[PDB]
Design a protein around this ligand. Structure first.
Ligand SMILES: O=C(O)c1nc2ccc(I)cc2c2[nH]c3c(Br)cccc3c12
Length: 342
C-alpha cells in the first residue's frame, strides 16, 4: 500500500516528480534512464549552476551496498584523474535523500548499443571503431595502475556512454560489479556475450578479463552484431570455439570446469563434448570481411576500409582474444599497435 512514506513505488524506486526541489539545491527535470540499480534523472545543480545526472539507487539494501562499492571505486579513480582524461565517468558527489543513495555525475548521452541501433545494426565505421578502441585501451591502462588495479568486470556496449551524441568521446560507467586485484571475491561475473574463457572455465582471473570483453565489443561495434551470442554457458563456449578453436591443453588441464564443455581423449588432447561449425572454422577474417568489402560487403567502395586497415584491426582483435590471460595483449601494447599508427 504505502512504500517509504509514499515516496517509493513497489519496485523500490523513488517516484520521480518533474520540477521537485531537493536539499535547497537540485531541481529535478526529468527521468533520462533506468536500470536494475534504480533511475537516472537530469537535474539542475543551482549551487554549481550546471546540469547533472543523478543516479538514484533503489531503497533496498543489496542495491544500496552495490552502489556504496561503486562510490568508493569512483572516488579512488576520480582522485587520480582530476583532468578527466582517462575516459572514466566523473562522480561529483553523493548523498542520501529520502532513503535513496544518490550519485551526482556529469551529464552524458546514450550508450554504444543505442549507437548501434542508430546504425540499423549495420555497424559504425572502422575509423570510429578505432577512436572507441583507443579511448577504451587508455581507460584500461589507467585501471591497471597499481593504486587502482580495478577490474571493471561488466564491460559491454551498454556500459560505455557517449559524452555527446554527435561526437566520438566516451566514458565508461557502472562499477557496481567491479573489484580490485588484491580483493577478488566473485566467481560468477561478466555479462555472457562478453565473458572471458577463464571465467567460463572457473579459473583464476585478473585485469585481462576486461581486454577479452573489449575485443568482443570492438568487433560488434563494426559489424553491428555480437561476436559470441551464447544463450547459455555451454552455447557461449561453443560459439567462442567455432572462431578460435579448442583452448590450449595447458589451460584445460588446470580448469575446474573443463568437463562442462570438453572431454579429454586417450592421447591427452581435448575435444568438445557432443549444430556447430567445426573448431576454428568460423574465421574472424570472414566475420570482418577483410578481403570482401567489410561486414555484409557494405564497406566496398568506401574510403577508410582498405584490406591493409582490416588486417591491422584483425591482428589487434586476435591478440585481445588470446585464450591465455598471461599472453593476451595488455593496454600499453594495445596502444602501440599498428592499428593506431595513422
Ligand atoms: O551510472 C551508470 O551505471 C549508469 N548506468 C546506466 C544504465 C542505464 C542507463 I538508460 C543509463 C545509465 C547511466 N546514465 C548515466 C549518465 Br546520462 C551519466 C552518468 C552515469 C550514468 C549511468
Amino acid at each position: 500500500k504505502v512504500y517509504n512514506d509514499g515516496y517509493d513505488d513497489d519496485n523500490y524506486d523513488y517516484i520521480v516528480k518533474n520540477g521537485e526541489k531537493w536539499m535547497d539545491r537540485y531541481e529535478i527535470d526529468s527521468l533520462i534512464g533506468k536500470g536494475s540499480f534504480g533511475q537516472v534523472v537530469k537535474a539542475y545543480d543551482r549551487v554549481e549552476q550546471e546540469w547533472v545526472a543523478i543516479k538514484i539507487i533503489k531503497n533496498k539494501k543489496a542495491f544500496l551496498n552495490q552502489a556504496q562499492i561503486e562510490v568508493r571505486l569512483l572516488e579512488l579513480m576520480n582522485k587520480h584523474d582530476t583532468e578527466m582524461k582517462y575516459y572514466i565517468v566523473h562522480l561529483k558527489r553523493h548523498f542520501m535523500f529520502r532513503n535513496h543513495l544518490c550519485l551526482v555525475f556529469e551529464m552524458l548521452s546514450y550508450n554504444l548499443y543505442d549507437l548501434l541501433r542508430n546504425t540499423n545494426f549495420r555497424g559504425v565505421s572502422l575509423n570510429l571503431t578505432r577512436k572507441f578502441a583507443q579511448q577504451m585501451c587508455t581507460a584500461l591502462l589507467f585501471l591497471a595502475t597499481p593504486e587502482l588495479s580495478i577490474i571493471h568486470c561488466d564491460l559491454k556496449p551498454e556500459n560505455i556512454l557517449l559524452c555527446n551524441p554527435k561526437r566520438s568521446a566516451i566514458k565508461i560507467v557502472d562499477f557496481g560489479s567491479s573489484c580490485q586485484l588484491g580483493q577478488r571475491i566473485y566467481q560468477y561475473i561478466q555479462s555472457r556475450f562478453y565473458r572471458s574463457p577463464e571465467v567460463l572455465l572457473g579459473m583464476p582471473y585478473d585485469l585481462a578479463i576486461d581486454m577479452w570483453s573489449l575485443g568482443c565489443i570492438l568487433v560488434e561495434m563494426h559489424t553491428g552484431e555480437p561476436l559470441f551470442s551464447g544463450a547459455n554457458e555451454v552455447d557461449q563456449m561453443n560459439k567462442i570455439v567455432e572462431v578460435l578453436g579448442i583452448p590450449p591443453a595447458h589451460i584445460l588441464d588446470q580448469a575446474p570446469k573443463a568437463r562442462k564443455f570438453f572431454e579429454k581423449l586417450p592421447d591427452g588432447t581435448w575435444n568438445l563434448k557432443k549444430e556447430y561449425k567445426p573448431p576454428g572454422t568460423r574465421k574472424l577474417h570472414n566475420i570482418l570481411g577483410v578481403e570482401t568489402g567489410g561486414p555484409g560487403g557494405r564497406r566496398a567502395g568506401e574510403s577508410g576500409h582498405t584490406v591493409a586497415d582490416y588486417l591491422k584491426f584483425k591482428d589487434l582483435i586476435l591478440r585481445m582474444l588470446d585464450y591465455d590471460p598471461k599472453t593476451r595483449i595488455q593496454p600499453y601494447y594495445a596502444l602501440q599497435h599498428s592499428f593506431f599508427k595513422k
